[PDB]
Enzyme design. Structure first.
Site, PDB file in Angstrom:
ATOM      1  N   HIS A  72      35.223 -27.852  16.300  1.00  0.00           N
ATOM      2  CA  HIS A  72      34.798 -29.247  16.534  1.00  0.00           C
ATOM      3  C   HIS A  72      34.599 -30.106  15.278  1.00  0.00           C
ATOM      4  O   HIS A  72      34.019 -29.564  14.329  1.00  0.00           O
ATOM      5  CB  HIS A  72      33.493 -29.274  17.309  1.00  0.00           C
TER       6      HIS A  72
ATOM      7  N   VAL B  47      42.501 -28.132  25.805  1.00  0.00           N
ATOM      8  CA  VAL B  47      43.099 -26.974  25.117  1.00  0.00           C
ATOM      9  C   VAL B  47      43.793 -26.095  26.174  1.00  0.00           C
ATOM     10  O   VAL B  47      44.883 -25.619  25.860  1.00  0.00           O
ATOM     11  CB  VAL B  47      42.077 -26.173  24.336  1.00  0.00           C
ATOM     12  N   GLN B  48      43.103 -25.930  27.285  1.00  0.00           N
ATOM     13  CA  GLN B  48      43.700 -25.200  28.425  1.00  0.00           C
ATOM     14  C   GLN B  48      45.111 -25.623  28.772  1.00  0.00           C
ATOM     15  O   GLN B  48      46.082 -24.848  28.891  1.00  0.00           O
ATOM     16  CB  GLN B  48      42.785 -25.411  29.625  1.00  0.00           C
TER      17      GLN B  48
ATOM     18  N   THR C 100      42.974  13.235   8.597  1.00  0.00           N
ATOM     19  CA  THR C 100      43.321  11.815   8.483  1.00  0.00           C
ATOM     20  C   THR C 100      43.959  11.511   7.113  1.00  0.00           C
ATOM     21  O   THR C 100      44.794  10.618   7.038  1.00  0.00           O
ATOM     22  CB  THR C 100      42.134  10.854   8.690  1.00  0.00           C
ATOM     23  N   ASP C 101      43.578  12.333   6.120  1.00  0.00           N
ATOM     24  CA  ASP C 101      44.288  12.256   4.838  1.00  0.00           C
ATOM     25  C   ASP C 101      45.773  12.525   4.963  1.00  0.00           C
ATOM     26  O   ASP C 101      46.636  11.936   4.333  1.00  0.00           O
ATOM     27  CB  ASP C 101      43.695  13.267   3.842  1.00  0.00           C
TER      28      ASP C 101
ATOM     29  N   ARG D 140      40.421 -37.894  20.262  1.00  0.00           N
ATOM     30  CA  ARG D 140      39.606 -36.997  19.428  1.00  0.00           C
ATOM     31  C   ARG D 140      40.545 -36.196  18.522  1.00  0.00           C
ATOM     32  O   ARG D 140      41.750 -36.178  18.646  1.00  0.00           O
ATOM     33  CB  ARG D 140      38.746 -36.060  20.247  1.00  0.00           C
TER      34      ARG D 140
ATOM     35  N   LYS E  43      43.398   7.140  10.648  1.00  0.00           N
ATOM     36  CA  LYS E  43      43.165   6.469   9.350  1.00  0.00           C
ATOM     37  C   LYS E  43      43.327   4.962   9.545  1.00  0.00           C
ATOM     38  O   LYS E  43      44.334   4.526  10.084  1.00  0.00           O
ATOM     39  CB  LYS E  43      44.132   7.000   8.278  1.00  0.00           C
TER      40      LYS E  43
ATOM     41  N   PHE F 171      39.790 -35.560  26.192  1.00  0.00           N
ATOM     42  CA  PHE F 171      39.034 -34.680  27.037  1.00  0.00           C
ATOM     43  C   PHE F 171      38.079 -35.483  27.927  1.00  0.00           C
ATOM     44  O   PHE F 171      36.992 -35.872  27.547  1.00  0.00           O
ATOM     45  CB  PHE F 171      38.269 -33.597  26.261  1.00  0.00           C
TER      46      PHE F 171
ATOM     47  N   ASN G   4      38.151 -23.962  19.684  1.00  0.00           N
ATOM     48  CA  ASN G   4      38.119 -25.418  19.484  1.00  0.00           C
ATOM     49  C   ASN G   4      37.079 -25.665  18.372  1.00  0.00           C
ATOM     50  O   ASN G   4      35.901 -25.475  18.646  1.00  0.00           O
ATOM     51  CB  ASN G   4      37.791 -26.105  20.806  1.00  0.00           C
TER      52      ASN G   4
END
Ligand SMILES: O=c1[nH]c(=O)c2[nH]c(=O)[nH]c2[nH]1
Ligand SMILES: O=c1[nH]c(=O)c2[nH]c(=O)[nH]c2[nH]1
Ligand SMILES: O=c1[nH]c(=O)c2[nH]c(=O)[nH]c2[nH]1
Ligand SMILES: O=c1[nH]c(=O)c2[nH]c(=O)[nH]c2[nH]1
Ligand code: NA
Ligand code: NA
Ligand code: NA
Ligand code: NA
EC number: 1.7.3.3
Lengths: 295, 295, 295, 295
Positions: free
Chosen positions: B256, B227-228, B57-58, B176, B10, B159, B254
């Site tokens: 932008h 970012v790395q 599943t109920d 940036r 479920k 960057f 990222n």
């Protein structure tokens, strides 16, 4: 056939602006989504394929950015008034401009109990909005709103004493959950033009703050008889605190949380005073609206 | 043909629970969305239309509610372990249970500088999640995460120095905007069963708090090279502070924000050091991922 | 700490391509959304702020467009293989490329029973997808899928004979509604490289057509014992018809439609054989999965 | 303060209905989402916590289901009129009912070229909608619409000859892509009550079909001068073909597809007559509206 009404423009124009205090080094950011639709003597574009009367929507887009570069973008009531006034003053044949602005939250981060100079967090999807209508020879009409403010109270909500007939199955209750998404709009007195909007600039942020504060405090403290009664209380307090608003409009869903009867399983008690686990319902939902003005 | 893998259950089970301190009158609410998928000796349901092996599943849905009624639902690592263990202990032929929980924010309101006893606000769409895999004879594997944490910094992101060839048009930059939606996952050492999860219960909330704090502080204070590089710094600090985690995984878009050249209009300066108005881009976006473990 | 895994790239790259037959004047359009993530000798970007090893994600974006200009974009299995192979052949230090493509529907309009030469309609949100993994020295792995195919049958669905214990409230039934969103994935045998993918190009469109046809016919004609049993039937027929596929994976929600008991109102009969009005449930939903391979 | 306007009700009520021909065995399904808001002498619920005047929104929900059980649900103009009339006739103090219905597509499947008796597919997210306002002593106002009809043409769209000033950067073009999401609304003459709506029942489905056909044919065949000119052509043809409609309203976004200049890479030609690969833009978008009536 004839054109009875027409408006056209650019929607979903995303804009960011930063302000940098070079003497303290603190930066402040603003982010919005803007829509601008124009009206005027433009029917021949529709009826006669006459594009000479069209201010291209691409140019409308450029104008939004240029206007943001050259003017304050806060409070949004002022920016929208500036933007709309530009179109009706610059183009002889354009007589109305309709500006909608959605303001997104970028709240300054606190790092180790200090406000950070250039870092921000989106603390909720709540929005601050304006709708500004600039109409040649009839001034500036502004509607301010907050939307997407989601709240819940776990008790001190009631709903009894309603009409009961052969369509009614709902039980009366003296203790329920109340949850909603607040949509609240305050409509300003008409302004004669941009000079008068400028004269009232400090009132816009303070009135937004007041509307937010009144909404949260009333929701938290009212032993609610219904959604109808609670929302009226909010509206009347806002009106009492800002004489320049003419009406307050609330639109509130009732996002239902259902009790779950578990007694079929080992006699478990989970209703009424024993209710602990509930099923939030995605749909349907109640929808309650009202517009309050002054007597 | 043959069944190579199978799981069923479920999804999207919404659950609310309230706790009431009757001696102080303070109430506390919890709201989540739960998914439970089971594995085991169930292939004949697929191949032979043999429903005798299916736990409906109920019924899985009912079990989630009953389990929430009878046990703590915080921290979610514990609740998910309890829930998953139930299925593998109750049904001989069910050998694995997979539990995913999404925790929604209900933050107590402060009214006039006092915490309110029963009123709550959703302060962002950020989520606290767990993935709990309970496998018969192989313990309990838990992955904890935070997601939907949206941040922006207006400067102190760079960057430059990247690979340049005949596919490259991007200019190097030393200043940036950086904005992302944080998705961060910490994977716990395997636990032998529910007794061992119980023994570590205080570590779950504290480790979530630490991961959140480290993420925000590192984002705010790092003069980011990429970012790395920034995300690696976050991961290594989390690992250093909780010995019982084996790996930390970050997944960061990222998002932008593009400069807008306005010089075509009256020579306006809005690039480089003069950049004030930017265009947020909805798509495309960079996507950066890494998994950090201990050497 | 150490980097255990890492991949990075560009997501949500929207691409349109048109083909124009200048001798008949018929135009054909293709629209997709592309994601490309790379792996290789890039850990120093994370650990040492060494950007010299990064192929900028902006350049990845440019490469997608250039590749679409110079090569066929159908079938998507071929385009994705071309794209992925480019990265691993062009950059010595990049050893794996992961390409995901979502194909959007633009179906030619028929005007007055004739196919129109340059006008198209989006006839559903169903998607055709591929996942292509290109790994240096290990070939090309392709997974093809259809998703977002939403269907309903009003009868000839049953669900009885399932496990009944003290957690069970669900009634058995011999006549119910069945509705689902089909997610179906077929995994191709490994290919040694791009030459072998080219050799099989006609098989990709025909196998997608077959998978779609088998899914719809089986859903429509099977007197279903459960979702489990019906989906197995679909998978086994697909495998029998394309020897180059190794496995078939289905993921199907059971989107429930509940009976509404109205007998409390004037004795109205709306259950069982009298059931005419039902309540579609948005959540929760069953979720059923299986992977079928060859014995 | 005073209540200036108020309406309340139930939103997002999902409804399914099936019809079974027991002599041919063919089944037909209908699925909609319904909203009902009421107005009348209800201000004291807001101002005085007087719930005696409230028809509970839960009861409104029940009434929708009961009404669907006892009456045809097609065409939706009729069902909505029946529903709205019920509230104003049953409750003395309720003077207006506002009904909105969204009709979801369930199109019969064809299996091996034969229409299947009980199996259906959702062939697009296009919707058929109605807005029905039932006002005591002023009849029934109906607005019918189609929405979510997404189309594209790859050529035979132009945009030149527009206003050029110091805000304008857009180049004129004689060959571009045009894509939109159609929102089209036709407003019926006022009807005096339910008897008059019944008398016109066959006109509702035929007028929807006509509006759809005219929209697609005009879009496909018009060598478009602008969005403005094309939409006017659609509106005027609909008005000419159904005398009982008073106005036609179109609201069309211009979903832009941008050329991509690749000449920086090996001199590749991808603009103007060489344009093959384009970048679909998610935002911003033009927005064009008009209301057409009869001269
Ligand atoms: O506050 C409420 N107002 C209503 O009008 C209503 N109707 C309903 O069913 N629940 C509620 N609750
Ligand atoms: O931090 C970033 N990392 C990248 O890999 C990349 N690529 C790109 O185009 N911009 C950025 N920024
Ligand atoms: O086809 C179904 N399979 C299940 O496993 C199940 N469980 C449930 O409650 N309904 C259904 N239906
Ligand atoms: O059809 C169009 N109408 C406009 O008003 C407009 N403006 C714009 O920039 N592109 C278009 N295209
Ligand atoms: Na003017
Ligand atoms: Na077991
Ligand atoms: Na390589
Ligand atoms: Na009445």
């Amino acid at each position: 056939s004839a054109v009875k009404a027409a408006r056209y423009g650019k929607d979903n124009v995303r804009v960011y602006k930063v302000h940098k205090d070079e003497k303290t080094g603190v930066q402040t950011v603003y982010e919005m989504t803007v829509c601008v639709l124009l009206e005027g003597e433009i029917e021949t574009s529709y009826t006669k394929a006459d594009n000479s009367v069209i201010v291209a929507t691409d140019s409308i887009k450029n104008t939004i950015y240029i206007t943001a570069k050259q003017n304050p973008v806060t409070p949004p009531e002022l920016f929208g008034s500036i933007l709309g006034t530009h179109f009706i003053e610059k183009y002889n044949h354009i007589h109305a401009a309709h500006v909608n602005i959605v303001c997104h939250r970028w709240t300054r981060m606190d790092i180790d109990g200090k406000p950070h100079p250039h870092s921000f967090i989106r603390d909720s999807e709540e929005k601050r909005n304006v709708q500004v209508d600039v109409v040649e020879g009839k001034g500036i009409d502004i509607k301010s709103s907050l939307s997407g403010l989601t709240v819940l109270k776990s008790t001190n909500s009631q709903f009894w004493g309603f009409l009961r007939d052969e369509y009614t199955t709902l039980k009366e209750t003296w203790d329920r959950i109340l949850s909603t998404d607040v949509d609240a709009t305050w409509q300003w007195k008409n302004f004669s033009g941009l000079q008068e909007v400028r004269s009232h600039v400090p009132k816009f942020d303070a009135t937004w703050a007041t509307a937010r504060e009144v909404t949260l405090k009333t929701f938290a403290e009212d032993n609610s008889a219904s959604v109808q009664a609670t929302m009226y209380k909010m509206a009347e307090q806002i009106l009492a605190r800002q004489q320049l608003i003419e009406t307050v409009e609330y639109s509130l869903p009732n996002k239902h949380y259902f009790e779950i009867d578990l007694s079929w399983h080992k006699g478990l008690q989970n209703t009424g005073k024993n209710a602990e686990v509930f099923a939030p319902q995605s749909d349907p939902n109640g929808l309650i609206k009202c517009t309050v003005g002054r007597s």
